[PDB]
Amino acid sequence: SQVFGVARIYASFNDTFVHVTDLSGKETIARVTGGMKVKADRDESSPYAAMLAAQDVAAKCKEVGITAVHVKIRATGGTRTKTPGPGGQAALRALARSGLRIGRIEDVTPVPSDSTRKKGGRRGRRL
Amino acid sequence: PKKRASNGRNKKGRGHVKPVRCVNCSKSIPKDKAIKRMAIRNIVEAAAVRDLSEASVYPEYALPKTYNKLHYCVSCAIHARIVRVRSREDRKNRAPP
Amino acid sequence: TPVTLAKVIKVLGRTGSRGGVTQVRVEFLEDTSRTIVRNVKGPVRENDILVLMESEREARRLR
Amino acid sequence: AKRTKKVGITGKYGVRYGSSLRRQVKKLEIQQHARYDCSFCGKKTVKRGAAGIWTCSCCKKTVAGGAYTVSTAAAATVRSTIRRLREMVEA
Amino acid sequence: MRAKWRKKRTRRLKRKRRKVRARSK
Amino acid sequence: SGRGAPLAKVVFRDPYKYRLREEIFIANEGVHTGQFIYAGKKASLNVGNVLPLGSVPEGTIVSNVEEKPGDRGALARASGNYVIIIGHNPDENKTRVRLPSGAKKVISSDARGVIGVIAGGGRVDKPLLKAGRAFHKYRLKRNSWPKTRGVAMNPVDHPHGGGNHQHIGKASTISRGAVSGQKAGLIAARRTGLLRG
Amino acid sequence: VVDPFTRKEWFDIKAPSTFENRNVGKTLVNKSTGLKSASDALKGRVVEVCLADLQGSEDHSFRKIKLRVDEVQGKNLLTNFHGMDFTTDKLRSMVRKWQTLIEANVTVKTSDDYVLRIFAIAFTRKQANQVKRHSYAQSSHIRAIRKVISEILTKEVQGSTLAQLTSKLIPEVINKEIENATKDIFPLQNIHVRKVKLLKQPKFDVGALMALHG
RNA sequence: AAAAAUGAUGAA
RNA sequence: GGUGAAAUUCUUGGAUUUAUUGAAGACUAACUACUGCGAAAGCAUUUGCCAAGGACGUUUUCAUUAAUCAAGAACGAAAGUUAGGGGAUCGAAGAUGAUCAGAUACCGUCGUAGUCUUAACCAUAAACUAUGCCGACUAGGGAUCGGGUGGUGUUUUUUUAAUGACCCACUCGGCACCUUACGAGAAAUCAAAGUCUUUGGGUUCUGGGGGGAGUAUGGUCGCAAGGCUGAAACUUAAAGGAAUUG
């Protein structure tokens, strides 16, 4: 009784992608990032930016016909942090509170079973 | 002088282990020495739990968790307050709390 | 209408480097079951009513 | 008695062409003039006629091989790979 | 100065000494 | 003479007339005198056998490969060279292979090749050490040795000739569209200098 | 300049008969144009579905399913089995410390020419009344368990059609029989197939697809 | 995880 | 994208992001431990082949065949060297954007050699337990790995009736750990670093205040880088260890 999409939230540091697609995933509806909700260049990964992006994405999911959405949360992954950025939870909650129905949340961060050498050098990034 | 009977690590019997990389700075640290934490968290924050349970299409959803094993070097663990410098006798305690 | 009335049901503590901001928990007046945590500038009591220009941002910088 | 300390067979070249080139040539000429085991008759009688041609002094069998060795590592690897592919095709 | 840098700069100096003495010889 | 790779004399029976037919194969390494060679669509996958590209599996090492079926061998003929089979396209009746230069090629699966690698490999690893051996090498091939540098000539003789010092004097990279008499140096070079620094 | 969603049809997606309720969801492509038709852009699509939704039960909350569109007829996309996998939360919740992790892996082809890779996962179990801290296995038990798991998996596949494999994956009979076969070697906790991937496909043979959709 | 260099000689 | 903040870069020729494929090289996460194996360096995907090894069991066999070792020999992280293959990633050098008084530093973006492999070299590390090896004895305790013994112990298809896992009690061997030091030590600490002025179980190697200096020179090994061996003149009253208070 509801039409489902897939939200495909990518919550890194430095940015947050909110990207709804069909079930197949190859048709995209309302990909909005925090970097085009804020103009600060450092607040691009903020929860406020993520919430504004998710509100826009829900607005465009409506009047296109998406009523419910499955959720694929993701971090940068690979050899990088694979900890979700600040904006993932704010985008999730904005999607849930902006009229969209929700189902089947899952974490799809790319995790290596083993990997190329990580960036930074042997002694790491020295601050 | 020698600060620690187990110099800074857990390696008695082998000699070489393998490096891991620090999650914060990517410093190479032997696995036996690295400070290791298991981050098991609900995939949805506690303040958003009610909102997502009300917005769910499933009457009885399970609210999955995320599992992530973090490896810290000594400097990053101390800077991030994961471990703290301890008094001379308190250093000998190995219990987690 | 972008004006939200929320009532302070609990004062959490002081925040800010200089201690000028206060963590509070407020419940909405339109519905008395939706509580949020906000950062407040001046002196606050329990049962004080705040005016929320926006009403979705959770308060950061906790203690 | 030991007549040369290191030049070996390249002592025919005297002092010319450079010691590195003489060392490379020494390695490959020792390989090229060695006697090799015959895979057919089991004797140590296989010598090079010309590059790639290896003939056993007895049983007179000739096998195509490497320029300076009877078998190259590539040819052995190819033989093993072809055997494996043959085995899966036949089974 | 750090010991490994004493060693490194001394090694460079020994290279220069060998070079000038080979020049003489 | 003039060839690094040894040759195998392989004699077959004539299917249609009572007589023998001698063929001149490029010997693959490990092939011996007195060995039975099988050629055809139903030949077994053994070193020295001649098979169509379609009938052999992925990763097969072949040599003397036909670009077109029936041209009797065009690819991977020099000593130590081979072709790697890297895939099939049964609907198109094509086989994808890797050539010795690294190029990827698509050939009809009816083209034949010899299982194995051309014999005589490792030949260019040994230095010639002296002009006399290069002389004997090229007197069995053709008159392309020795080579006089263009900058050692006069302007009448070569584009690089002349000058009060030996020097090219203009870029030695020459366009593909240049005419005969101009194409000396590096023709249509996409890049110059030492590869990967 | 132009709204791109005025040229969409919202094709419906149908699951094979080897599942509970057939209606999976919805998808959209484009208006069929004389240059490019919707069918080509709509075939080959992989739709990711939770087996809980395919079966109408929450005990299949993990172990998601991939459905591959094989052809379009009318406004219905008839899918077929394309893969199975566990959810990340399930895998990470099962992989805990102080127990041995046993993984097995086979590649086998069904009765029809569906060559596919089957995985399998199991963990060592503490006995009731066990006082020892960890319950690790002795690396010969692991090899014996892996051998018997491989034979069981190779035996249930290549003796079945892809449909029969799916219809025996849903009730989880392979992991129960793995437990029965391994119970004399070492006790185990979480025996699962965890993943099925398909490597090569046979000819289209649309008759079998229509046998699964009817 | 912004920046922060230096401090003449002897002197119960 | 990236950062503390940026910029260098990419981007309506569609970047980033989504999907379906493919190729390549490298790695072997989670499980993973005060756990295992190896002479050390080291060694973590599956399966097959090849030889090897410790411990245990042994009313098997030989009978001193042993311990430590100048000379001598094999192996020996990383980097580095020669030549071929490979060359995804990261990344000395280099190039660039920042920061800065400067900043060819830290931070950012690239990027050569290198990183991987085959065949040869090199022979060095805080190559560390900064504790040579062999042997004997001296204190309480609980775990753990491998082997063995016992229990009329539990548990699994049939509920002692076709045999693993677990439990209990011992034992040999091992990685260790906790408490305490009767003892030792300058102390830190140590179960050996004890059995040392009540000084002797056997044996090898090394040191003799700090610098000059692991330098010069000679020899020798190495393709080289360099390794090994290795002074003197001269100079100087401390340098150094472990703790205490600030």
PDB file of N, CA and C (backbone and C1' of nucleotides) in Angstrom, chain I residues 73-106:
ATOM      1  P     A I  73      84.423 -19.045   6.794  1.00  0.00           P
ATOM      2  O5'   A I  73      83.031 -19.807   6.927  1.00  0.00           O
ATOM      3  C5'   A I  73      82.653 -20.789   5.978  1.00  0.00           C
ATOM      4  C4'   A I  73      81.503 -21.636   6.460  1.00  0.00           C
ATOM      5  C3'   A I  73      80.124 -21.016   6.364  1.00  0.00           C
ATOM      6  O3'   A I  73      79.596 -21.044   5.053  1.00  0.00           O
ATOM      7  C1'   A I  73      80.369 -22.047   8.467  1.00  0.00           C
ATOM      8  P     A I  74      78.685 -19.832   4.530  1.00  0.00           P
ATOM      9  O5'   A I  74      77.220 -20.235   4.989  1.00  0.00           O
ATOM     10  C5'   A I  74      76.584 -21.382   4.455  1.00  0.00           C
ATOM     11  C4'   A I  74      75.302 -21.692   5.182  1.00  0.00           C
ATOM     12  C3'   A I  74      74.266 -20.580   5.240  1.00  0.00           C
ATOM     13  O3'   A I  74      73.480 -20.488   4.066  1.00  0.00           O
ATOM     14  C1'   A I  74      74.546 -21.501   7.391  1.00  0.00           C
ATOM     15  P     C I  75      72.918 -19.070   3.565  1.00  0.00           P
ATOM     16  O5'   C I  75      71.842 -18.672   4.667  1.00  0.00           O
ATOM     17  C5'   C I  75      70.592 -19.336   4.740  1.00  0.00           C
ATOM     18  C4'   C I  75      69.858 -18.992   6.011  1.00  0.00           C
ATOM     19  C3'   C I  75      69.441 -17.542   6.180  1.00  0.00           C
ATOM     20  O3'   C I  75      68.254 -17.224   5.475  1.00  0.00           O
ATOM     21  C1'   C I  75      70.441 -18.306   8.173  1.00  0.00           C
ATOM     22  P     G I  76      68.067 -15.780   4.797  1.00  0.00           P
ATOM     23  O5'   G I  76      68.173 -14.756   6.009  1.00  0.00           O
ATOM     24  C5'   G I  76      67.128 -14.626   6.961  1.00  0.00           C
ATOM     25  C4'   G I  76      67.568 -13.785   8.130  1.00  0.00           C
ATOM     26  C3'   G I  76      67.926 -12.342   7.808  1.00  0.00           C
ATOM     27  O3'   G I  76      66.790 -11.496   7.803  1.00  0.00           O
ATOM     28  C1'   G I  76      69.648 -13.314   9.102  1.00  0.00           C
ATOM     29  P     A I  77      66.365 -10.685   6.488  1.00  0.00           P
ATOM     30  O5'   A I  77      65.196  -9.738   6.993  1.00  0.00           O
ATOM     31  C5'   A I  77      64.003 -10.282   7.534  1.00  0.00           C
ATOM     32  C4'   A I  77      63.159  -9.220   8.186  1.00  0.00           C
ATOM     33  C3'   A I  77      62.937  -7.955   7.375  1.00  0.00           C
ATOM     34  O3'   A I  77      61.935  -8.103   6.386  1.00  0.00           O
ATOM     35  C1'   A I  77      63.485  -7.382   9.595  1.00  0.00           C
ATOM     36  P     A I  78      62.151  -7.518   4.910  1.00  0.00           P
ATOM     37  O5'   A I  78      62.248  -5.945   5.113  1.00  0.00           O
ATOM     38  C5'   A I  78      61.198  -5.209   5.720  1.00  0.00           C
ATOM     39  C4'   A I  78      61.653  -3.822   6.091  1.00  0.00           C
ATOM     40  C3'   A I  78      62.386  -3.059   5.004  1.00  0.00           C
ATOM     41  O3'   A I  78      61.522  -2.443   4.070  1.00  0.00           O
ATOM     42  C1'   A I  78      63.612  -2.913   7.001  1.00  0.00           C
ATOM     43  P     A I  79      61.872  -2.489   2.507  1.00  0.00           P
ATOM     44  O5'   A I  79      62.959  -1.342   2.314  1.00  0.00           O
ATOM     45  C5'   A I  79      62.732  -0.022   2.785  1.00  0.00           C
ATOM     46  C4'   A I  79      64.030   0.685   3.074  1.00  0.00           C
ATOM     47  C3'   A I  79      65.003   0.764   1.913  1.00  0.00           C
ATOM     48  O3'   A I  79      64.702   1.835   1.037  1.00  0.00           O
ATOM     49  C1'   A I  79      66.147   0.026   3.845  1.00  0.00           C
ATOM     50  P     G I  80      64.743   1.636  -0.553  1.00  0.00           P
ATOM     51  O5'   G I  80      66.273   1.338  -0.861  1.00  0.00           O
ATOM     52  C5'   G I  80      67.273   2.284  -0.528  1.00  0.00           C
ATOM     53  C4'   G I  80      68.651   1.687  -0.614  1.00  0.00           C
ATOM     54  C3'   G I  80      68.990   0.989  -1.914  1.00  0.00           C
ATOM     55  O3'   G I  80      69.321   1.891  -2.951  1.00  0.00           O
ATOM     56  C1'   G I  80      69.696  -0.339  -0.097  1.00  0.00           C
ATOM     57  P     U I  81      68.892   1.567  -4.460  1.00  0.00           P
ATOM     58  O5'   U I  81      69.985   0.524  -4.945  1.00  0.00           O
ATOM     59  C5'   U I  81      71.366   0.819  -4.833  1.00  0.00           C
ATOM     60  C4'   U I  81      72.209  -0.352  -5.252  1.00  0.00           C
ATOM     61  C3'   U I  81      71.803  -1.030  -6.545  1.00  0.00           C
ATOM     62  O3'   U I  81      72.266  -0.339  -7.689  1.00  0.00           O
ATOM     63  C1'   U I  81      72.239  -2.662  -4.895  1.00  0.00           C
ATOM     64  P     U I  82      71.427  -0.369  -9.055  1.00  0.00           P
ATOM     65  O5'   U I  82      71.720  -1.812  -9.659  1.00  0.00           O
ATOM     66  C5'   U I  82      72.991  -2.150 -10.192  1.00  0.00           C
ATOM     67  C4'   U I  82      72.983  -3.543 -10.769  1.00  0.00           C
ATOM     68  C3'   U I  82      71.840  -3.856 -11.720  1.00  0.00           C
ATOM     69  O3'   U I  82      72.049  -3.363 -13.030  1.00  0.00           O
ATOM     70  C1'   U I  82      72.111  -5.638 -10.198  1.00  0.00           C
ATOM     71  P     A I  83      70.841  -2.668 -13.821  1.00  0.00           P
ATOM     72  O5'   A I  83      70.056  -3.885 -14.482  1.00  0.00           O
ATOM     73  C5'   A I  83      70.734  -4.824 -15.300  1.00  0.00           C
ATOM     74  C4'   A I  83      69.991  -6.134 -15.392  1.00  0.00           C
ATOM     75  C3'   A I  83      68.492  -6.063 -15.638  1.00  0.00           C
ATOM     76  O3'   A I  83      68.149  -5.802 -16.987  1.00  0.00           O
ATOM     77  C1'   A I  83      68.923  -7.618 -13.934  1.00  0.00           C
ATOM     78  P     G I  84      66.783  -5.034 -17.336  1.00  0.00           P
ATOM     79  O5'   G I  84      65.649  -6.136 -17.130  1.00  0.00           O
ATOM     80  C5'   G I  84      65.374  -7.076 -18.156  1.00  0.00           C
ATOM     81  C4'   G I  84      64.495  -8.214 -17.695  1.00  0.00           C
ATOM     82  C3'   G I  84      63.043  -7.901 -17.390  1.00  0.00           C
ATOM     83  O3'   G I  84      62.249  -7.685 -18.540  1.00  0.00           O
ATOM     84  C1'   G I  84      63.887  -9.354 -15.746  1.00  0.00           C
ATOM     85  P     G I  85      61.045  -6.623 -18.491  1.00  0.00           P
ATOM     86  O5'   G I  85      59.918  -7.340 -17.625  1.00  0.00           O
ATOM     87  C5'   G I  85      59.259  -8.505 -18.092  1.00  0.00           C
ATOM     88  C4'   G I  85      58.506  -9.199 -16.986  1.00  0.00           C
ATOM     89  C3'   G I  85      57.321  -8.446 -16.404  1.00  0.00           C
ATOM     90  O3'   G I  85      56.153  -8.538 -17.197  1.00  0.00           O
ATOM     91  C1'   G I  85      58.627  -9.321 -14.650  1.00  0.00           C
ATOM     92  P     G I  86      55.243  -7.240 -17.434  1.00  0.00           P
ATOM     93  O5'   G I  86      54.653  -6.907 -15.995  1.00  0.00           O
ATOM     94  C5'   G I  86      53.630  -7.707 -15.422  1.00  0.00           C
ATOM     95  C4'   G I  86      53.527  -7.493 -13.935  1.00  0.00           C
ATOM     96  C3'   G I  86      52.983  -6.147 -13.480  1.00  0.00           C
ATOM     97  O3'   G I  86      51.569  -6.084 -13.496  1.00  0.00           O
ATOM     98  C1'   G I  86      54.938  -6.653 -12.264  1.00  0.00           C
ATOM     99  P     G I  87      50.813  -4.822 -14.138  1.00  0.00           P
ATOM    100  O5'   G I  87      51.031  -3.653 -13.081  1.00  0.00           O
ATOM    101  C5'   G I  87      50.706  -3.817 -11.709  1.00  0.00           C
ATOM    102  C4'   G I  87      51.459  -2.827 -10.863  1.00  0.00           C
ATOM    103  C3'   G I  87      51.291  -1.372 -11.271  1.00  0.00           C
ATOM    104  O3'   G I  87      50.128  -0.800 -10.704  1.00  0.00           O
ATOM    105  C1'   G I  87      53.590  -1.858 -10.978  1.00  0.00           C
ATOM    106  P     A I  88      49.425   0.483 -11.361  1.00  0.00           P
ATOM    107  O5'   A I  88      48.237   0.813 -10.355  1.00  0.00           O
ATOM    108  C5'   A I  88      46.899   0.455 -10.657  1.00  0.00           C
ATOM    109  C4'   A I  88      46.143   0.024  -9.427  1.00  0.00           C
ATOM    110  C3'   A I  88      46.395   0.829  -8.164  1.00  0.00           C
ATOM    111  O3'   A I  88      45.676   2.048  -8.129  1.00  0.00           O
ATOM    112  C1'   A I  88      46.505  -1.466  -7.655  1.00  0.00           C
ATOM    113  P     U I  89      46.374   3.382  -7.577  1.00  0.00           P
ATOM    114  O5'   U I  89      46.619   3.068  -6.042  1.00  0.00           O
ATOM    115  C5'   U I  89      45.537   2.952  -5.132  1.00  0.00           C
ATOM    116  C4'   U I  89      46.008   2.383  -3.820  1.00  0.00           C
ATOM    117  C3'   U I  89      46.954   3.273  -3.029  1.00  0.00           C
ATOM    118  O3'   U I  89      46.266   4.204  -2.214  1.00  0.00           O
ATOM    119  C1'   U I  89      47.849   1.086  -3.173  1.00  0.00           C
ATOM    120  P     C I  90      46.617   5.767  -2.263  1.00  0.00           P
ATOM    121  O5'   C I  90      47.826   5.929  -1.243  1.00  0.00           O
ATOM    122  C5'   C I  90      47.711   5.524   0.112  1.00  0.00           C
ATOM    123  C4'   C I  90      49.037   5.045   0.647  1.00  0.00           C
ATOM    124  C3'   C I  90      50.173   6.054   0.586  1.00  0.00           C
ATOM    125  O3'   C I  90      50.162   6.941   1.690  1.00  0.00           O
ATOM    126  C1'   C I  90      50.908   3.975  -0.269  1.00  0.00           C
ATOM    127  P     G I  91      50.733   8.434   1.557  1.00  0.00           P
ATOM    128  O5'   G I  91      52.231   8.253   1.050  1.00  0.00           O
ATOM    129  C5'   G I  91      53.275   7.869   1.934  1.00  0.00           C
ATOM    130  C4'   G I  91      54.533   7.532   1.174  1.00  0.00           C
ATOM    131  C3'   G I  91      55.195   8.690   0.443  1.00  0.00           C
ATOM    132  O3'   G I  91      56.065   9.415   1.297  1.00  0.00           O
ATOM    133  C1'   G I  91      55.000   6.823  -1.010  1.00  0.00           C
ATOM    134  P     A I  92      56.368  10.972   1.063  1.00  0.00           P
ATOM    135  O5'   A I  92      57.947  11.085   1.194  1.00  0.00           O
ATOM    136  C5'   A I  92      58.809  10.462   0.260  1.00  0.00           C
ATOM    137  C4'   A I  92      60.106  10.048   0.901  1.00  0.00           C
ATOM    138  C3'   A I  92      61.304  10.956   0.646  1.00  0.00           C
ATOM    139  O3'   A I  92      61.392  12.054   1.535  1.00  0.00           O
ATOM    140  C1'   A I  92      61.895   8.747   0.135  1.00  0.00           C
ATOM    141  P     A I  93      61.300  13.567   1.001  1.00  0.00           P
ATOM    142  O5'   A I  93      62.111  13.574  -0.367  1.00  0.00           O
ATOM    143  C5'   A I  93      63.524  13.441  -0.396  1.00  0.00           C
ATOM    144  C4'   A I  93      64.036  13.361  -1.810  1.00  0.00           C
ATOM    145  C3'   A I  93      63.695  14.535  -2.708  1.00  0.00           C
ATOM    146  O3'   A I  93      64.537  15.650  -2.495  1.00  0.00           O
ATOM    147  C1'   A I  93      63.295  12.523  -3.866  1.00  0.00           C
ATOM    148  P     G I  94      63.920  17.125  -2.385  1.00  0.00           P
ATOM    149  O5'   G I  94      63.095  17.307  -3.729  1.00  0.00           O
ATOM    150  C5'   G I  94      63.750  17.428  -4.982  1.00  0.00           C
ATOM    151  C4'   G I  94      62.788  17.239  -6.125  1.00  0.00           C
ATOM    152  C3'   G I  94      61.658  18.248  -6.201  1.00  0.00           C
ATOM    153  O3'   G I  94      62.060  19.476  -6.773  1.00  0.00           O
ATOM    154  C1'   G I  94      60.775  16.087  -6.463  1.00  0.00           C
ATOM    155  P     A I  95      61.512  20.859  -6.175  1.00  0.00           P
ATOM    156  O5'   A I  95      60.076  21.019  -6.832  1.00  0.00           O
ATOM    157  C5'   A I  95      59.870  20.699  -8.197  1.00  0.00           C
ATOM    158  C4'   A I  95      58.417  20.455  -8.490  1.00  0.00           C
ATOM    159  C3'   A I  95      57.462  21.512  -7.980  1.00  0.00           C
ATOM    160  O3'   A I  95      57.437  22.635  -8.834  1.00  0.00           O
ATOM    161  C1'   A I  95      56.590  19.349  -7.548  1.00  0.00           C
ATOM    162  P     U I  96      57.200  24.101  -8.240  1.00  0.00           P
ATOM    163  O5'   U I  96      55.622  24.252  -8.301  1.00  0.00           O
ATOM    164  C5'   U I  96      54.904  24.768  -7.201  1.00  0.00           C
ATOM    165  C4'   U I  96      53.597  24.050  -7.012  1.00  0.00           C
ATOM    166  C3'   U I  96      52.770  24.536  -5.837  1.00  0.00           C
ATOM    167  O3'   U I  96      52.006  25.676  -6.151  1.00  0.00           O
ATOM    168  C1'   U I  96      52.938  22.197  -5.734  1.00  0.00           C
ATOM    169  P     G I  97      52.164  27.007  -5.275  1.00  0.00           P
ATOM    170  O5'   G I  97      50.901  26.946  -4.316  1.00  0.00           O
ATOM    171  C5'   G I  97      49.622  26.611  -4.826  1.00  0.00           C
ATOM    172  C4'   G I  97      48.699  26.184  -3.719  1.00  0.00           C
ATOM    173  C3'   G I  97      48.744  27.046  -2.475  1.00  0.00           C
ATOM    174  O3'   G I  97      48.014  28.249  -2.619  1.00  0.00           O
ATOM    175  C1'   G I  97      48.757  24.767  -1.861  1.00  0.00           C
ATOM    176  P     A I  98      48.311  29.484  -1.644  1.00  0.00           P
ATOM    177  O5'   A I  98      47.654  29.034  -0.268  1.00  0.00           O
ATOM    178  C5'   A I  98      48.263  29.340   0.973  1.00  0.00           C
ATOM    179  C4'   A I  98      47.873  28.332   2.018  1.00  0.00           C
ATOM    180  C3'   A I  98      48.271  28.661   3.444  1.00  0.00           C
ATOM    181  O3'   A I  98      47.353  29.540   4.070  1.00  0.00           O
ATOM    182  C1'   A I  98      48.822  26.412   2.961  1.00  0.00           C
ATOM    183  C1'   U I  99      50.860  27.978   7.727  1.00  0.00           C
ATOM    184  C3'   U I  99      49.909  30.002   8.504  1.00  0.00           C
ATOM    185  C4'   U I  99      48.837  29.126   7.891  1.00  0.00           C
ATOM    186  O3'   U I  99      49.450  30.746   9.615  1.00  0.00           O
ATOM    187  C5'   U I  99      47.851  29.832   6.998  1.00  0.00           C
ATOM    188  O5'   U I  99      48.517  30.619   6.022  1.00  0.00           O
ATOM    189  P     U I  99      47.833  30.963   4.629  1.00  0.00           P
ATOM    190  P     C I 100      49.738  32.320   9.698  1.00  0.00           P
ATOM    191  O5'   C I 100      51.292  32.411  10.011  1.00  0.00           O
ATOM    192  C5'   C I 100      51.866  31.692  11.090  1.00  0.00           C
ATOM    193  C4'   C I 100      53.358  31.551  10.929  1.00  0.00           C
ATOM    194  C3'   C I 100      54.116  32.813  10.571  1.00  0.00           C
ATOM    195  O3'   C I 100      54.309  33.680  11.674  1.00  0.00           O
ATOM    196  C1'   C I 100      54.914  31.006   9.271  1.00  0.00           C
ATOM    197  P     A I 101      54.198  35.269  11.472  1.00  0.00           P
ATOM    198  O5'   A I 101      55.447  35.616  10.550  1.00  0.00           O
ATOM    199  C5'   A I 101      55.780  36.952  10.215  1.00  0.00           C
ATOM    200  C4'   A I 101      57.204  37.039   9.729  1.00  0.00           C
ATOM    201  C3'   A I 101      57.676  35.866   8.878  1.00  0.00           C
ATOM    202  O3'   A I 101      57.417  36.084   7.502  1.00  0.00           O
ATOM    203  C1'   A I 101      59.249  36.303  10.608  1.00  0.00           C
ATOM    204  P     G I 102      56.743  34.950   6.594  1.00  0.00           P
ATOM    205  O5'   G I 102      57.967  34.021   6.196  1.00  0.00           O
ATOM    206  C5'   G I 102      59.114  34.564   5.561  1.00  0.00           C
ATOM    207  C4'   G I 102      60.316  33.682   5.765  1.00  0.00           C
ATOM    208  C3'   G I 102      60.092  32.200   5.516  1.00  0.00           C
ATOM    209  O3'   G I 102      60.252  31.868   4.148  1.00  0.00           O
ATOM    210  C1'   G I 102      61.233  32.518   7.579  1.00  0.00           C
ATOM    211  P     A I 103      59.101  31.095   3.341  1.00  0.00           P
ATOM    212  O5'   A I 103      58.985  29.680   4.057  1.00  0.00           O
ATOM    213  C5'   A I 103      60.082  28.772   4.070  1.00  0.00           C
ATOM    214  C4'   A I 103      59.684  27.432   4.633  1.00  0.00           C
ATOM    215  C3'   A I 103      58.176  27.143   4.632  1.00  0.00           C
ATOM    216  O3'   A I 103      57.954  25.754   4.416  1.00  0.00           O
ATOM    217  C1'   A I 103      59.018  26.884   6.787  1.00  0.00           C
ATOM    218  P     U I 104      57.971  25.118   2.949  1.00  0.00           P
ATOM    219  O5'   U I 104      59.124  24.041   3.063  1.00  0.00           O
ATOM    220  C5'   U I 104      60.414  24.283   2.527  1.00  0.00           C
ATOM    221  C4'   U I 104      60.868  23.105   1.714  1.00  0.00           C
ATOM    222  C3'   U I 104      62.224  22.530   2.107  1.00  0.00           C
ATOM    223  O3'   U I 104      62.163  21.105   2.101  1.00  0.00           O
ATOM    224  C1'   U I 104      62.235  23.143  -0.191  1.00  0.00           C
ATOM    225  P     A I 105      62.076  20.319   3.499  1.00  0.00           P
ATOM    226  O5'   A I 105      61.005  21.135   4.350  1.00  0.00           O
ATOM    227  C5'   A I 105      59.687  20.648   4.550  1.00  0.00           C
ATOM    228  C4'   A I 105      59.498  20.176   5.969  1.00  0.00           C
ATOM    229  C3'   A I 105      58.084  19.813   6.388  1.00  0.00           C
ATOM    230  O3'   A I 105      57.706  18.511   5.986  1.00  0.00           O
ATOM    231  C1'   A I 105      59.058  21.177   8.038  1.00  0.00           C
ATOM    232  P     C I 106      56.195  18.209   5.550  1.00  0.00           P
ATOM    233  O5'   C I 106      55.434  17.945   6.924  1.00  0.00           O
ATOM    234  C5'   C I 106      55.980  17.100   7.926  1.00  0.00           C
ATOM    235  C4'   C I 106      55.445  17.450   9.292  1.00  0.00           C
ATOM    236  C3'   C I 106      53.932  17.537   9.413  1.00  0.00           C
ATOM    237  O3'   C I 106      53.337  16.270   9.633  1.00  0.00           O
ATOM    238  C1'   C I 106      54.944  19.420  10.455  1.00  0.00           C
TER     239        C I 106
END
